[PDB]
Amino acid sequence: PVYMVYVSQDRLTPSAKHAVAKAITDAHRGLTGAQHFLAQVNFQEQPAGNVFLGGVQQGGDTIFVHGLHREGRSADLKGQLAQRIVDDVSVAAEIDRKHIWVYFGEMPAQQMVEYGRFLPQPGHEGEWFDNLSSDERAFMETNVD
Template identity: 40%
Template sequence: MPTYQVFMSPQCLSKESKQRVAQAITSTHHDVTGAANFFAQVIFNAKSAEDYYLGGSPLKAPHLFVHGHIRARSLEVKQQLAARLLDAVADAAQLDKRYVWIYISDLQPEVMVEFGYPLPPPGKEAEWMATLAPEDLAYMQGVDFKPPQNRS
């Protein structure tokens, strides 16, 4: 359901950092919206130095731009999500918050299809999942990650 695109400057994140950022985004989205972890996808897009500009000039510092496409939520939920994502992503990437930008965009669930099914409105996930074919539900739940208990 939510798709987060993370655009980053060259060599901004290691493989391990990407894993931490993906888990931070997934956990934060779940904590704020209640959506199951297996719905969240995080896609990293590394941009070369010649393809990333800020203010019309080539980027000079490590930078992450996180654009979340989520099912329509209230303004309050989106504000909370953006603020919590900023903290979580900056921590996971070990970057100062000034280098992490978060944008949240609404998508109407009526025009979204995932795992082969049209999506339900927010808050109707349990009823929706009850109508899915058992093999589709098993696949969906099989991609769920378990957040680490303790992170150093």
């Protein structure tokens, strides 16, 4: 999937970004079974003061995570996973839970392209990894930490 993660500039060091990215990627693999490299975490940094809560200007502890997913998963799972992104980012970034916003949007797999291919359904990933070129299979396996 794709996680847009809006944050203030300089709020996270490279280690913290790599820490927040990691906890999100491990939330997702861990509750869905998705092959790691399938997850993208994409930081959007903007200057602090660009974020307003109830018309009040905020400092730089706001975190907004927008996960773009595939249709097909239960409402009980999306909650856990959202809840787990809340907890594990709160630790990884050392910011209070109450500073964290998480929305999930969903689309059908057939209008969702990753690594230049169309995606499988959620219960079809095994077929997905057993019908790609190895130039492809090699690339994605470089994208796992």
